[PDB]
């Protein structure tokens, strides 16, 4: 069914080409219908991060690198501003929203990834590199297209599925364009319940779905 507003849950990204957990985030539900999922992730959640094997934050790496050195999973404490997440079933990617202090909103973030998968926990995705910046005026770019081009080239994605993901970012393009879901819609002017705990990382957070 759908999880009620409140209600805690994780959502987690695979590794790349593989089936265990390497992020991990507890989330408050915001909204869970037909429609749309809306989760809020709090500044200072605990959350679980890929790093490489040898301590080098993924980001840190260079780029020749960064999809082929081991990796392993660290718990650490979300750095920085909290995020809302928005997702619309079946679709292949989500919607984040950030806001510099005092809620000035900044921007909306589009991540393209694999459509969530709904599990007993929460939601399940792999990310697909490429992501689309989208500014409070209507125009965007893209980001992170070296990242993209690298994991092609490292072959961790085959032409056919970069070819995907490429179409998905055309669709979104189209929906920036048109002020479209969910640009339109004042996710700007959301706020938090101030009542609203933040969320603990369960022991069990890597469990796969069943
Ligand atoms: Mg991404
Ligand atoms: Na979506
Ligand atoms: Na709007
Ligand atoms: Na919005």
Redesign the pocket.
Known sequence: GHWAPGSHILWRYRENGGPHVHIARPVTVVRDDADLLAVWLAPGTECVKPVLADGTPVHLEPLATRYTKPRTVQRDQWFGTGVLK?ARPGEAWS?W?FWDPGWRFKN?YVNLERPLTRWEGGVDSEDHFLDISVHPDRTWHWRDEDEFAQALRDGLMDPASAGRVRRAGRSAVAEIRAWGS?????????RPDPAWPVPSLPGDWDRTPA
């Not at 969910?182 to 959301?190: L, S």
Request: no cysteine; charged share 15%.
């Open positions: 928005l919607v929203l909306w969910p640009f339109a819609d004042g996710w700007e002017h959301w």
